[PDB]
Design an enzyme around this catalytic site. Structure first.
Site, PDB file in Angstrom:
ATOM      1  N   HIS A 173      -1.206  -7.918  16.610  1.00  0.00           N
ATOM      2  CA  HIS A 173      -1.655  -7.198  15.420  1.00  0.00           C
ATOM      3  C   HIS A 173      -0.667  -6.300  14.676  1.00  0.00           C
ATOM      4  CE1 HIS A 173      -4.666  -5.700  12.835  1.00  0.00           C
ATOM      5  NE2 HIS A 173      -4.748  -4.501  13.389  1.00  0.00           N
TER       6      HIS A 173
ATOM      7  N   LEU B 132       0.868  -1.177   0.000  1.00  0.00           N
ATOM      8  CA  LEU B 132       0.000   0.000   0.000  1.00  0.00           C
ATOM      9  C   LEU B 132       0.906   1.227   0.000  1.00  0.00           C
ATOM     10  CD1 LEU B 132      -3.446   0.434   1.817  1.00  0.00           C
ATOM     11  CD2 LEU B 132      -2.138   2.088   0.727  1.00  0.00           C
TER      12      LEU B 132
ATOM     13  N   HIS C 290      -0.820  -7.535   2.896  1.00  0.00           N
ATOM     14  CA  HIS C 290      -1.594  -7.479   4.113  1.00  0.00           C
ATOM     15  C   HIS C 290      -2.459  -6.257   4.193  1.00  0.00           C
ATOM     16  CE1 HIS C 290      -2.017  -8.366   8.614  1.00  0.00           C
ATOM     17  NE2 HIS C 290      -2.740  -9.207   7.903  1.00  0.00           N
TER      18      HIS C 290
ATOM     19  N   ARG D   1      -0.205   2.686  18.552  1.00  0.00           N
ATOM     20  CA  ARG D   1      -0.815   3.170  17.324  1.00  0.00           C
ATOM     21  C   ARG D   1      -2.324   3.271  17.456  1.00  0.00           C
ATOM     22  NH1 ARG D   1      -3.883   0.651  14.192  1.00  0.00           N
ATOM     23  NH2 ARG D   1      -4.037   0.904  11.893  1.00  0.00           N
TER      24      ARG D   1
ATOM     25  N   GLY E 129     -10.926   0.595   8.296  1.00  0.00           N
ATOM     26  CA  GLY E 129     -11.123   1.898   7.714  1.00  0.00           C
ATOM     27  C   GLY E 129      -9.861   2.729   7.787  1.00  0.00           C
TER      28      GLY E 129
ATOM     29  N   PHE F  80     -13.890   4.767  16.047  1.00  0.00           N
ATOM     30  CA  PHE F  80     -12.815   3.803  16.045  1.00  0.00           C
ATOM     31  C   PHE F  80     -11.814   4.203  17.114  1.00  0.00           C
ATOM     32  CE2 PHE F  80      -9.552   1.234  13.940  1.00  0.00           C
ATOM     33  CZ  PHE F  80     -10.321   0.150  13.621  1.00  0.00           C
TER      34      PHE F  80
ATOM     35  N   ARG G  72      -5.807   1.164  22.493  1.00  0.00           N
ATOM     36  CA  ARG G  72      -5.789  -0.272  22.280  1.00  0.00           C
ATOM     37  C   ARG G  72      -5.034  -0.990  23.380  1.00  0.00           C
ATOM     38  NH1 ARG G  72      -8.148  -0.907  17.376  1.00  0.00           N
ATOM     39  NH2 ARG G  72      -6.195  -0.078  16.516  1.00  0.00           N
TER      40      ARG G  72
ATOM     41  N   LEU H 208      -8.454 -11.654  12.806  1.00  0.00           N
ATOM     42  CA  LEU H 208      -8.984 -10.445  13.393  1.00  0.00           C
ATOM     43  C   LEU H 208     -10.428 -10.219  12.966  1.00  0.00           C
ATOM     44  CD1 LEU H 208      -7.740  -6.896  13.651  1.00  0.00           C
ATOM     45  CD2 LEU H 208      -9.473  -7.359  12.020  1.00  0.00           C
TER      46      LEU H 208
ATOM     47  N   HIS I 141      -4.048  -6.475  19.595  1.00  0.00           N
ATOM     48  CA  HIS I 141      -5.398  -6.048  19.377  1.00  0.00           C
ATOM     49  C   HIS I 141      -6.338  -6.938  20.181  1.00  0.00           C
ATOM     50  CE1 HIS I 141      -8.360  -3.776  17.129  1.00  0.00           C
ATOM     51  NE2 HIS I 141      -8.980  -4.896  16.810  1.00  0.00           N
TER      52      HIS I 141
ATOM     53  N   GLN J  97       1.934  -3.924  19.463  1.00  0.00           N
ATOM     54  CA  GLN J  97       0.580  -3.619  19.865  1.00  0.00           C
ATOM     55  C   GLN J  97      -0.271  -4.844  19.660  1.00  0.00           C
ATOM     56  OE1 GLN J  97      -2.470  -1.907  17.803  1.00  0.00           O
ATOM     57  NE2 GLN J  97      -2.730  -0.063  19.080  1.00  0.00           N
TER      58      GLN J  97
ATOM     59  N   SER K  54      -3.085   3.692  10.284  1.00  0.00           N
ATOM     60  CA  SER K  54      -2.029   3.112   9.467  1.00  0.00           C
ATOM     61  C   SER K  54      -2.313   3.179   7.996  1.00  0.00           C
ATOM     62  CB  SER K  54      -1.800   1.661   9.822  1.00  0.00           C
ATOM     63  OG  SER K  54      -1.162   1.638  11.078  1.00  0.00           O
TER      64      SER K  54
ATOM     65  N   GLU L 235     -12.562  -3.722  14.491  1.00  0.00           N
ATOM     66  CA  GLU L 235     -12.878  -2.813  15.582  1.00  0.00           C
ATOM     67  C   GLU L 235     -14.003  -1.858  15.235  1.00  0.00           C
ATOM     68  OE1 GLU L 235     -10.582   0.336  18.619  1.00  0.00           O
ATOM     69  OE2 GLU L 235      -9.894   0.023  16.578  1.00  0.00           O
TER      70      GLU L 235
HETATM   71  C1  LIG Z   1      -6.249  -8.534   9.643  1.00  0.00           C
HETATM   72  C2  LIG Z   1      -5.406  -7.255   9.582  1.00  0.00           C
HETATM   73  C3  LIG Z   1      -6.336  -6.223   9.642  1.00  0.00           C
HETATM   74  C4  LIG Z   1      -5.906  -4.890   9.617  1.00  0.00           C
HETATM   75  N1  LIG Z   1      -6.901  -3.847   9.680  1.00  0.00           N
HETATM   76  C5  LIG Z   1      -6.482  -2.492   9.647  1.00  0.00           C
HETATM   77  C6  LIG Z   1      -7.507  -1.446   9.714  1.00  0.00           C
HETATM   78  O1  LIG Z   1      -8.607  -1.784   9.780  1.00  0.00           O
HETATM   79  N2  LIG Z   1      -7.168  -0.090   9.694  1.00  0.00           N
HETATM   80  C7  LIG Z   1      -5.761   0.204   9.600  1.00  0.00           C
HETATM   81  O2  LIG Z   1      -5.399   1.324   9.579  1.00  0.00           O
HETATM   82  N3  LIG Z   1      -4.735  -0.813   9.512  1.00  0.00           N
HETATM   83  C8  LIG Z   1      -5.098  -2.181   9.548  1.00  0.00           C
HETATM   84  N4  LIG Z   1      -4.129  -3.210   9.467  1.00  0.00           N
HETATM   85  C9  LIG Z   1      -2.691  -2.892   9.383  1.00  0.00           C
HETATM   86  C10 LIG Z   1      -2.142  -2.895   7.971  1.00  0.00           C
HETATM   87  O3  LIG Z   1      -1.704  -4.171   7.609  1.00  0.00           O
HETATM   88  C11 LIG Z   1      -0.891  -2.073   7.831  1.00  0.00           C
HETATM   89  O4  LIG Z   1      -0.851  -0.935   8.694  1.00  0.00           O
HETATM   90  C12 LIG Z   1      -0.786  -1.649   6.391  1.00  0.00           C
HETATM   91  O5  LIG Z   1      -2.070  -1.640   5.709  1.00  0.00           O
HETATM   92  C13 LIG Z   1       0.243  -2.551   5.705  1.00  0.00           C
HETATM   93  O6  LIG Z   1       0.741  -1.911   4.539  1.00  0.00           O
HETATM   94  P1  LIG Z   1       2.292  -1.936   4.116  1.00  0.00           P
HETATM   95  O7  LIG Z   1       2.336  -1.392   2.690  1.00  0.00           O
HETATM   96  O8  LIG Z   1       3.268  -1.167   5.010  1.00  0.00           O
HETATM   97  O9  LIG Z   1       2.829  -3.415   4.103  1.00  0.00           O
HETATM   98  P2  LIG Z   1       2.013  -4.717   3.719  1.00  0.00           P
HETATM   99  O10 LIG Z   1       0.628  -4.403   3.237  1.00  0.00           O
HETATM  100  O11 LIG Z   1       1.915  -5.450   5.017  1.00  0.00           O
HETATM  101  O12 LIG Z   1       2.741  -5.643   2.643  1.00  0.00           O
HETATM  102  C14 LIG Z   1       4.173  -5.506   2.552  1.00  0.00           C
HETATM  103  C15 LIG Z   1       4.597  -5.537   1.070  1.00  0.00           C
HETATM  104  O13 LIG Z   1       5.874  -5.768   0.973  1.00  0.00           O
HETATM  105  C16 LIG Z   1       6.038  -7.220   0.304  1.00  0.00           C
HETATM  106  N5  LIG Z   1       6.983  -8.063   0.932  1.00  0.00           N
HETATM  107  C17 LIG Z   1       6.685  -8.907   1.955  1.00  0.00           C
HETATM  108  N6  LIG Z   1       7.816  -9.582   2.264  1.00  0.00           N
HETATM  109  C18 LIG Z   1       8.817  -9.174   1.421  1.00  0.00           C
HETATM  110  C19 LIG Z   1      10.169  -9.556   1.307  1.00  0.00           C
HETATM  111  N7  LIG Z   1      10.910 -10.543   2.100  1.00  0.00           N
HETATM  112  N8  LIG Z   1      10.981  -8.995   0.371  1.00  0.00           N
HETATM  113  C20 LIG Z   1      10.469  -8.044  -0.486  1.00  0.00           C
HETATM  114  N9  LIG Z   1       9.141  -7.689  -0.365  1.00  0.00           N
HETATM  115  C21 LIG Z   1       8.308  -8.242   0.584  1.00  0.00           C
HETATM  116  C22 LIG Z   1       4.893  -7.816   0.466  1.00  0.00           C
HETATM  117  O14 LIG Z   1       4.624  -8.754  -0.665  1.00  0.00           O
HETATM  118  C23 LIG Z   1       3.845  -6.718   0.433  1.00  0.00           C
HETATM  119  O15 LIG Z   1       3.443  -6.479  -0.841  1.00  0.00           O
HETATM  120  C24 LIG Z   1      -4.576  -4.593   9.522  1.00  0.00           C
HETATM  121  C25 LIG Z   1      -3.644  -5.627   9.450  1.00  0.00           C
HETATM  122  C26 LIG Z   1      -4.043  -6.955   9.484  1.00  0.00           C
HETATM  123  C27 LIG Z   1      -2.999  -8.061   9.407  1.00  0.00           C
HETATM  124  O1  LIG Z   2     -10.218  -4.399  14.143  1.00  0.00           O
HETATM  125  C1  LIG Z   2     -10.088  -3.366  13.424  1.00  0.00           C
HETATM  126  O2  LIG Z   2     -11.122  -2.891  12.876  1.00  0.00           O
HETATM  127  C2  LIG Z   2      -8.719  -2.710  13.232  1.00  0.00           C
HETATM  128  C3  LIG Z   2      -7.982  -2.300  14.242  1.00  0.00           C
HETATM  129  C4  LIG Z   2      -6.646  -1.668  13.893  1.00  0.00           C
HETATM  130  O3  LIG Z   2      -5.707  -2.373  13.426  1.00  0.00           O
HETATM  131  O4  LIG Z   2      -6.526  -0.429  14.068  1.00  0.00           O
END
Ligand SMILES: Cc1cc2nc3c(=O)[nH]c(=O)nc-3n(C[C@H](O)[C@H](O)[C@H](O)COP(=O)(O)OP(=O)(O)OC[C@H]3O[C@@H](n4cnc5c(N)ncnc54)[C@H](O)[C@@H]3O)c2cc1C
Ligand SMILES: O=C(O)/C=C/C(=O)O
Ligand SMILES: Cc1cc2nc3c(=O)[nH]c(=O)nc-3n(C[C@H](O)[C@H](O)[C@H](O)COP(=O)(O)OP(=O)(O)OC[C@H]3O[C@@H](n4cnc5c(N)ncnc54)[C@H](O)[C@@H]3O)c2cc1C
Ligand SMILES: CC(C)=CCC/C(C)=C/CC/C(C)=C/CC/C(C)=C/CC/C(C)=C/CC/C(C)=C/CC/C(C)=C/CC1=C(C)C(=O)c2ccccc2C1=O
Ligand code: HEM
Ligand code: HEM
Ligand code: HEM
Ligand code: HEM
Ligand SMILES: CCCCCCCCCCCCO[C@@H]1O[C@H](CO)[C@@H](O[C@H]2O[C@H](CO)[C@@H](O)[C@H](O)[C@H]2O)[C@H](O)[C@H]1O
Ligand SMILES: CCCCCCCCCCCCO[C@@H]1O[C@H](CO)[C@@H](O[C@H]2O[C@H](CO)[C@@H](O)[C@H](O)[C@H]2O)[C@H](O)[C@H]1O
Ligand code: SF4
Ligand code: F3S
Ligand code: FES
Lengths: 240, 622, 212, 212, 79, 79
Positions: free
Chosen positions: B369, B15, B43, B405, B50, B141, B301, B267, B257, B255, B410, B270
């Protein structure tokens, strides 16, 4: 729940030629509410670690779990060993370039096929400023927009489409519905004629023979049947 | 071998990685995005809750501003955060939400009328603005005051990443999915790229580029129970850790959850506690006003998670073969409602559990989480010990969050933060250009990284990779939980150090093949263990309780002698992380104070009254 | 001018694919209405050979087999051209569609194969029957004899299933795919059409024996 | 097990392709031999009505048409199935071939398109002729002079050029495609063969008018 | 090859020797190229590939199109 | 900009160029062969005469040796 699940897993490895396809039998004890994600990860991480499965979230919204389960392309993690019979047969998704064992490359197809259909919002570029206020959207349009943008791009509705499996250049219920999701969006400024240029010539829309395997295999339940339908009308009515 | 070039290499496709690649590409640089799996499945897609950005449109947010956002942000972070980072972020969240909304997300919007909401476990009526109909809707939230969290039904992550990706394809970001980064390409504290591994062939590749980013996300799979997807080992962290040049920040802050689902560990969102959540005990008693009286399950949290393990030590959990747990009651909320008709946590409980939320109660337990620490960055997001390395995301310590957080921040950090860090990456790349010496990519890197692959494949060194993995999991679950004491911590760190030794001698249960899927995990066991002891030894030698780090022997907050950030380097060749400490934002806009929930006992800051408000040169103007 | 490739017809693009698909569907409806006309007029020997003979000398001097017979010959083959586009003649289209069709265990998928096999049988015998009765000799109930006993037309035990199966899966299909779909109305349509098909094959086999 | 991709049907690759084309060549060859015999034996009206009546009684009363009628019936449809593989049904296969063939001015290329139009005309008209004369009524020259001239069959002019045109190009092509011809011998084969055909149109058109 | 001054041809080229020089010289110079490469390896400073290279040479292209110094390249070719 | 890597860059793909690419690739090195037109059609393809090399086979060359080759080469070519 204690009963003995026996798995027959497809086994192939294109990188060393000596590996021919075959059917390998596995043995797992079933516990209560166990996903095939649990079964396979213990088969791998315990007995044979060189089994290749593609797992991401084990919560069912990503689409790496796709495979054929006892004849139906389905989701391994989001499918539970309650519903399946005592012996299981897991096959790699068809239509898709098999990388090995149960793993196939899908996203490649989705990106080529994506450019084919050009799935993004085409901005007329009125010089929009995120300084200023945002777009006008009713809740129900944006909600069906969510219903279609909700696709998880798993690969099941293509791997179940006889048309696709028969004609590889066919671009899939997926692609039809994706263009749908840009048709009904206002933010995408595209003439209906542009939409025909994308899916209106054959190999997308009129290539469909109507097997309805999309609608019946889709794990997240997109409204493929009637969205495909309303798209074949909207495009077919290009005529005079 | 197989050297690729680009300008902007985004290691991770999720993302943040996607937003940054889209900005390098919006200003027109050539870009490679490495991804362990297709960028769609990351992820960020599993995100159900949201996206938090101050709007002002919903009635339950009326008057909200980024002043409130910043304020809330800092308070949630226990003043563990960089207040420059969080200012910029709080003001940049809306710019980014109008923007991404303009990219076609299906944000749920406002409906004029009077609706029947839920605040506590009791509903109240509230209107909705008559003139802000179609604008972007929010929801309650976390520890927010006003409702700022913006959502699309349930999967907001799916729906925001999804249009972010369509912008990727439109602007032509070349994407190599199935690329597992292994070491970083550097020398002279200058970063030229990384060496990577083809998740198809099995041979190394070596992307070369001027400006390189670490998007790899959380490390939570070092724990038995985590809401993290199985792809989260923290790659970019372990590649920035083996350099010994750039450190890990605030690593101990992990953190938990509270509503993590019990049987699967999945999960549940929330937005459930956020719209009339009801946390109940074994006897089905709403116990949150007993512990946190006013903010109850809308508390911070780490607060609710702490209170829950408390209440559960008392003996009041529900007993399951899965372990004892509490309940989350959304049957409260209504049937045809369920976060727009479908709710997609409805499917979580439907397929994986035996529970229907409009009838029964969701077995829920605090479980792992978000992962706060990561590759330390600056206000512009350049990583610490090495030039040209950038990071954003979960894998990163920007420290706009600190020690806890705030929920929903995030997502806004990925687009807010990917946009800002990207912008600075863009103009840094459009500045000076390196010299790619091949005795860096070739000498070591391909060599050392190919060398660890050979040692893990051919050698004796026999230890099974899954025993060091699962023994690690037990070590972290028991040693460092929600509630922490000095002695269990050191006991843990001691066995984790010896496990790092054991994790250097690794063997594979398998028969080598082109692309063996075992080796993917086996070679990163050492790395997993490493940043795990960064978190553990970070928590042991930090004697105070702040944020999610709660020490039973040092319960007060202790602002005097720790208002700071725990930076962990590695440096060879050692068995132990070196721990250095650094000021948490001297910028303090809101000086250290009380969060307005939790049991806060602080040793009040003494030094800071010197500086406090001195916002002198603000290049936060944007 | 444009005689090589690059894009389509006229100065930009060609709509021919939709027009012709629309024309495969319009042939499907028109042929379905006829085969209703046929299974009304000629199934009237159950009721009385007088009703069938009477309504048979009725329409435009006995359904105008001068001007309406060529209608259904040219129209049935025109359908044949429009459908052969998709028919699995290539040895791999068959082989695959048979392997996928047995593994999916999915219904409507397998009925496509019957639309095909039925398609070739009703091509030949449909043409040759439609022809022997499509000629002169204005129609009687007695003429059959063009069936049955001393008659050597024994094939409507084969033509009837292949035909009414084909018309059924075709009626069902033309409903989905063009927006008359479900999934709400999908099942009511599903057993409406299933009922419709087995009902027409029954009163056809009973028109067949009650012609004897 | 192999219900997936891999490569074809057995532990290496499929041989179905060569077998399949080859049997198109032998359905074309065996069917060409039949039409020789047909237009020899039953082309006897001009020699004598008695001669054709007898030569028909020569083998089991009109040349064993209960074992030879289903022979050319099912085998001719199996030809139709094997060749329909390459038939330009897809509106673009037509569109392209029409422009490529009109721009090239190349003869045999352009003869493929007539091989096509001919093929559909003879499935319809041929299936109904072969059928009407295949249903019992052992042959009499006088009854065949019946239909022809009344039935009403007639036509066959709308069949004979299309038919022998097809069989002709079919012999020419089958000779080249598997190598029985030049360059060295090439023109002899084409001019020779175009004469074979124009001669078949002659002895057929007069077998036709003389049957009347 | 022909582009090269190896000087097996000197000031008069032997008939039939220029084919022999391209393949023979490819074998020999090639062997030598595999030696010099398989050995030590360089550093591609982008203030060379990027600075000048792209800079000076895209400068010749832009000066040829959008610029003055107007004279026909063909008249100069034929003259 | 739009940078490509290889070990051996052959500017020209014709006959000398191809051989050198073939031995670098024979030892398994990344090699890019640039050509103004497809490698088959070059000026090496227009060579009608033949290629001059010592044989020992032909009856008009019986006894032929590289000595004479070396000699005639040097001497027709001046130095
Ligand atoms: C069930 C769950 C629910 C969540 N709900 C919320 C929410 O409701 N609201 C909120 O704000 N946040 C939420 N989060 C948190 C959220 O995951 C993160 O804050 C954020 O969306 C992750 O984005 P990111 O781009 O940093 O990394 P990620 O989305 O976690 O992905 C990392 C990227 O780097 C790649 N990568 C992975 N490993 C490697 C490697 N060894 N080498 C090279 N590349 C790699 C991966 O393929 C991936 O594409 C939730 C998380 C989970 C697990
Ligand atoms: O359970 C949720 O909706 C998300 C919580 C969070 O990661 O902030
Ligand atoms: C009509 C003719 C007949 C000949 N007959 C004989 C004979 O019979 N026997 C004999 O021994 N010798 C003969 N020669 C000589 C022969 O041409 C050379 O000695 C040799 O064959 C040329 O091969 P080459 O691969 O070295 O160069 P060339 O054949 O000249 O090929 C040049 C290569 O460089 C590429 N290139 C060109 N321009 C650029 C550019 N600006 N940038 C990057 N790459 C570029 C080209 O596209 C091409 O791939 C003949 C020459 C000619 C013209
Ligand atoms: C048994 C009832 C009965 C009197 C049957 C004989 C009359 C017939 C066969 C009419 C044929 C006929 C039928 C059956 C239609 O359905 C149709 C639909 C729309 C337009 C025209 C027609 C039509 O002409
Ligand atoms: C030579 C004659 C015929 C052949 C070869 C044939 C074959 C086919 C085939 C293969 C299809 C499937 C098209 C697809 O899957 O996309 C089809 C469609 C159809 N057929 Fe026929 N059929 C013939 C005559 C008939 C007859 C006698 C009927 C009787 C009512 C009929 C009714 C239909 C209908 C309604 C459709 C659906 C149209 C559509 O998909 O748009 N056809 N036919
Ligand atoms: C103008 C066109 C047609 C007319 C007037 C017509 C008329 C008749 C008549 C008089 C019969 C009864 C006895 C006999 O078969 O000799 C009959 C039976 C039959 N015909 Fe036709 N026919 C026509 C075309 C067709 C077509 C297009 C089909 C398509 C498959 C068809 C299929 C059948 C079948 C299956 C039967 C017997 C089955 C049953 O009675 O249920 N005919 N038709
Ligand atoms: C429904 C009936 C028929 C159809 C659809 C048909 C169509 C065709 C087609 C499309 C081909 C082309 C194969 C290719 O292009 O590679 C072909 C070849 C041929 N046809 Fe027919 N035709 C029919 C009846 C006949 C008849 C009555 C004869 C009489 C002898 C005949 C003799 C031949 C021959 C010899 C070939 C050459 C075989 C080859 O190329 O290997 N066909 N036919
Ligand atoms: C069992 C198979 C066949 C038998 C018993 C047979 C026999 C006959 C008979 C009895 C006639 C009547 C002569 C008249 O109309 O006065 C005839 C005419 C004709 N039939 Fe056949 N035939 C057979 C196969 C075929 C085939 C495969 C074709 C392909 C088009 C065909 C086309 C014709 C033509 C074109 C004529 C009249 C033209 C002429 O004689 O030159 N028949 N045949
Ligand atoms: C209305 C249109 C009708 C469609 C056209 C007529 C049917 C299709 C014609 C081509 C059929 C191809 O024939 C198909 O494959 C080969 C022939 O090479 C046959 O031979 C074998 O093929 C494969 C073996 O690898 C198997 O799936 C099959 O069980 C076996 O018989 C199959 O039995 C048949 O399913
Ligand atoms: C092999 C079996 C027999 C072959 C059958 C193959 C089916 C395809 C036949 C039809 C193909 C026609 O191919 C081409 O179609 C286009 C579009 O309809 C026609 O286009 C023409 O009519 C259309 C429709 O009014 C006009 O818009 C257009 O201005 C005009 O040029 C061409 O005149 C025709 O040459
Ligand atoms: S349609 Fe259903 S199956 Fe096909 S991709 Fe969208 S979600 Fe996955
Ligand atoms: S299964 Fe296939 S034909 Fe269209 S109906 Fe669905 S894509
Ligand atoms: S594993 Fe993530 S969806 Fe099946």
């Amino acid at each position: 729940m204690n009963r003995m699940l026996t798995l027959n897993i497809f086994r192939y490895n294109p990188l060393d030629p000596d590996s021919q396809p075959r059917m390998q039998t596995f043995t797992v004890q079933e516990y209560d509410s166990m996903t095939l994600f649990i079964a396979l990860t213990q088969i791998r991480d315990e007995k044979d670690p060189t089994l290749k499965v593609d797992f991401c979230c084990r919560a069912g919204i990503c689409g790496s779990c796709a495979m054929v389960i006892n004849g139906r392309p389905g989701l391994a993690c989001h499918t539970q060993t309650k519903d399946l019979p005592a012996e299981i047969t897991l096959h790699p998704l068809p239509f898709f370039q098999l990388l090995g064992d149960l793993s196939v490359d899908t996203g490649s197809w989705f990106r080529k096929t994506g450019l084919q259909i050009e799935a993004w919002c085409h901005s007329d570029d009125k010089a929009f400023d995120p300084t200023a206020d945002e777009m006008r959207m009713d809740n129900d349009l944006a909600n069906e927009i969510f219903e279609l943008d909700r696709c998880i791009e798993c690969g099941c509705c293509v791997a179940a489409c006889g048309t696709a499996r028969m004609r590889t250049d066919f671009l899939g219920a997926v692609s039809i519905m994706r263009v749908a999701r840009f048709y009904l969006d206002p933010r995408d400024k595209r003439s209906e004629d542009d939409y025909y240029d994308v899916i209106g010539n054959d190999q997308g829309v009129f290539g469909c023979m109507g097997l309805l395997a999309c609608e019946d295999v889709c794990p997240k339940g997109i409204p493929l049947q009637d969205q495909l339908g309303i798209m074949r009308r909207m495009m077919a009515m290009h005529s005079v | 071998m197989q050297i690729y070039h680009t300008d902007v290499l985004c290691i991770g496709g999720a993302l943040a990685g996607e937003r940054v690649a889209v900005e390098a590409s919006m200003a027109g640089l050539k870009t490679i995005m490495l991804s362990l799996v297709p960028p769609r499945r990351s992820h960020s897609s599993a995100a159900q809750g949201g996206m938090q950005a101050a709007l002002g449109n919903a009635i339950m947010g009326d008057g909200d501003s980024p002043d409130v956002h910043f304020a809330d942000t800092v308070k949630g972070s226990d003043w563990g955060c960089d207040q420059e980072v969080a200012r910029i972020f709080a003001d940049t969240a809306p710019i980014v939400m109008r923007e991404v909304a303009h990219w076609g997300v299906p944000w749920n919007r406002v409906v004029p009328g009077k609706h029947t909401y839920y605040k506590g476990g009791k509903p109240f009526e509230a209107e909705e603005k008559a003139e802000k109909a179609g604008l972007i809707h929010a929801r309650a939230f976390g520890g927010t005051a006003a409702w700022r969290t913006c959502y699309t039904a349930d999967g907001t992550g799916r729906s925001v990443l999804n249009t972010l990706d369509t912008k990727c394809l439109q602007y032509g970001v070349t994407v190599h999915d199935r690329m597992q980064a292994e070491a970083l390409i550097h020398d002279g504290g200058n970063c030229l790229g990384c060496i990577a591994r083809c998740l198809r062939t099995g041979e190394l590749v070596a992307y070369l580029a001027t400006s390189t980013l670490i998007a790899t996300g959380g490390y939570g799979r070092i724990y038995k129970a985590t809401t993290n997807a199985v792809i989260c080992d923290g790659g970019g962290q372990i590649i920035a850790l083996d350099t010994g040049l750039v450190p890990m920040g605030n690593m101990e802050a992990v953190q938990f959850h509270p509503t993590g689902t019990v049987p699967t560990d999945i999960l549940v969102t929330e937005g459930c506690r956020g719209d009339g959540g009801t946390l109940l005990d074994v006897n089905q008693y709403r116990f949150m006003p007993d512990y946190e009286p006013d903010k109850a399950q809308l508390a911070s949290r780490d607060v609710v998670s702490r209170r829950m393990t408390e209440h559960m030590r008392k003996g009041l959990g529900v007993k399951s073969p899965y372990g004892d747990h509490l309940w989350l009651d959304i049957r409260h909320l209504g049937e045809k409602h369920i976060t727009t008709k479908l709710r997609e946590v409805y499917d979580i409980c439907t397929n994986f559990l035996g529970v229907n939320p409009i009838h029964q109660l969701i077995p829920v337990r605090p479980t792992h989480h978000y992962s706060m620490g990561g590759v330390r960055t600056n206000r512009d997001g350049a990583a610490y010990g090495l030039k040209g390395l950038f990071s954003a995301g979960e894998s990163a310590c920007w420290d706009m969050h600190g020690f806890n957080r705030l929920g929903g921040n995030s997502l806004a950090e990925t687009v807010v933060a990917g946009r800002y860090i990207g912008e600075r990456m863009v103009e840094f790349t459009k500045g000076a250009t390196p010299s790619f010496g091949m005795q860096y990519v070739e000498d070591a890197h391909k060599k050392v990284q190919e060398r660890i692959t050979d040692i893990v494949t051919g050698r004796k060194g026999k230890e099974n990779t899954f025993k060091i993995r699962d023994e690690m999991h037990d070590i972290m679950m028991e040693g460092v939980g929600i509630f922490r004491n000095g002695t269990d911590l050191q006991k843990a760190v001691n066995k984790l150090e010896e496990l790092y030794d054991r994790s250097q001698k690794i063997s594979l249960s398998s028969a080598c093949k082109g692309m063996n899927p075992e080796l993917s995990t086996a070679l990163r066991i050492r790395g997993m263990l490493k940043l795990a002891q960064c978190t553990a030894y970070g928590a042991l030698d930090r004697t105070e309780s702040r944020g999610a780090h709660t020490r039973e022997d040092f319960p007060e907050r202790n602002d005097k002698e720790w208002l700071n950030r725990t930076l962990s380097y590695w440096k060879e060749g050692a068995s132990m992380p070196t721990l250095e400490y650094e000021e948490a934002s001297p910028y303090y806009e809101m000086p250290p104070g009380d969060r307005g929930y939790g049991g806060g006992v602080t040793i009040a800051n003494e030094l800071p009254p010197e500086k406090f408000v001195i916002p002198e040169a603000a290049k936060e103007n944007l | 001018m444009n005689a090589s490739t690059i894009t389509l017809h006229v100065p930009q693009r060609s709509k021919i694919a939709g027009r012709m698909d629309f024309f495969q569907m319009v042939s499907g409806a028109l042929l379905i209405l006829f085969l209703w006309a046929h299974m009304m007029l000629v199934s009237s020997v159950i009721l009385s050979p007088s009703l069938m003979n009477g309504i048979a000398w009725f329409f435009e001097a006995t359904y105008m087999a001068q001007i309406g017979g060529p209608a259904v010959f040219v129209l049935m083959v025109v359908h044949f051209i429009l459908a052969a586009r998709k028919m699995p003649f290539k040895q791999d289209e068959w082989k695959t569609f048979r392997v996928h069709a047995c593994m999916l265990h999915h219904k409507d998928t397998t009925m496509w194969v019957v639309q095909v096999i039925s398609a070739i049988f009703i091509l030949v015998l449909g043409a040759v029957h439609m022809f022997v009765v499509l000629t002169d000799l204005p129609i009687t109930a007695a003429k059959s004899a063009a069936r049955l006993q001393s008659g050597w037309l024994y094939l409507y035990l084969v033509l009837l299933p292949l035909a009414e199966l084909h018309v059924g899966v075709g009626f069902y299909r033309i409903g989905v795919k063009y927006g008359f779909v479900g999934r709400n109305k999908r099942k009511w349509f599903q057993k409406t059409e299933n009922l419709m098909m087995i009902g027409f094959i029954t009163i056809g086999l009973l028109t067949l024996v009650r012609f004897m």
